[PDB]
Amino acid sequence: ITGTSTVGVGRGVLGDQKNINTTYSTYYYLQDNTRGNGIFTYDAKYRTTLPGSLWADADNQFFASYDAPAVDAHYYAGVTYDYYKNVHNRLSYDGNNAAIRSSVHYSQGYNNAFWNGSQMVYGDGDGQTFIPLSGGIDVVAHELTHAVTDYTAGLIYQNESGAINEAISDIFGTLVEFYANKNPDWEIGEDVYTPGISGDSLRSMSDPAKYGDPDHYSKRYTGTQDNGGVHINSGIINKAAYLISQGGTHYGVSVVGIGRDKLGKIFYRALTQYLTPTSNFSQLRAAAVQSATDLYGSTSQEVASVKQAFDAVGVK
Ligand SMILES: [Ca+2]
Ligand SMILES: [Ca+2]
Ligand SMILES: [Ca+2]
Ligand SMILES: [Ca+2]
Ligand SMILES: [Zn+2]
Q: Which residues, by range, are in coiled-coil regions?
């Protein structure tokens, strides 16, 4: 909508207070004009018709229980935008400042979130398995990263290319969580997962097997469930990325870690320069090796660590 840029205040899913960029035009709208061509947040009103209504508020204060998922979807979309702009010089998900749109209160008891090809969508959860999923910054960044992938490598959402697609979203979801620097970790979804169970998460990048996901290519899932295990076999790539950053010895193969920032540069370069819709795990390794070579040189520790990491998870 046309209006004037304003700044509201509210509370997110976890009870924390934050300021949010809004737009005034009779009502105050969750429309942030400070980032590219706008970040827009919508109310799906417990239904499945998308996007719903652009979120309107009478007084620019967002402290109602019903407001909380919208506050976090809106605010964490902005953080993710800032990450890609400041760290990777990428303007929104298409590289040309496309509007970022999100809908919250999707359906009833919906224990998921997703990028639907054009926008983000967040359930409120059922209060047992999940609380409203926009409360997790790694969830928000995970899903917006799908938009980035779909515009760049275009990895097909099945089998190994789909597992790479999922892993890329976990990797940059985690790096955005570290970038915002609020209780960062190598776990996925911990802030909105199982409110009655402390210390768990949906997936682990540091130890995928913690939740039954493979941590080595020999353990990969080869059936047809989950579009050929896209959320399962992602553990193999997640483990490789964790090793590249943090280091470790995995099934006897030692990896010298090179840090989060270099992990991000290597995988962003691989995603945007070398990966294709049909890339498999071995092709990802080659993309990452070439990316590290471009960035740091053929004889660098960085290249050596990429090789060791993919060796450790059995990807040749
Ligand atoms: Ca209000
Ligand atoms: Ca965390
Ligand atoms: Ca996390
Ligand atoms: Ca939990
Ligand atoms: Zn995903």
A: none
Domain boundary among 125, 154, 183: 154
CATH number at residue 183: 1.10.390.10
CA 161 to chain centre: 17
How many angstroms separate the first and last alpha carbons of the chain? Answer: 51
Number of domain units in the chain:
2
Q: What is the largest CA-CA distance in the chain?
A: 64
Is 231 annotated as catalytic? yes
Do 299 and 207 reside in the same domain of the chain? yes
| Å from CA of 58 to ligand 5 middle | 34
Listed resolution, Å: 2.0
Same domain? For 66 and 128 the reply is yes
Q: How many residues does the chain have?
A: 316
Q: How many CB atoms lie within 10 A of CB 224?
A: 10
Number of H helices, E strands in the chain: 8, 15
258 known member of a binding site: no
Collapsing DSSP to helix, strand or coil, 271 comes out as helix
Q: Which of 143, 160, 250, 302 is catalytic?
A: 143
Method: X-ray
**Phi, psi angle pair for 245, to nearest 5°:** -75, -55
- Residue span of the structural domain in which 113 resides: 6-154
Q: Which of 188, 286, 168 is nearest to 234 (CA)?
A: 168
Whether 160 is catalytic = no
Please tell me the number of the ligand nearest to residue 205's CA.
3
Alpha-carbon distance of 111 to 114, in angstroms, equals 11
The verdict on whether omega for the bond into residue 69 sits within 30 degrees of 0, i.e. cis, is no
Whether residues 52 and 145 fall in one domain:
yes
Structural domain includes residue 190: yes
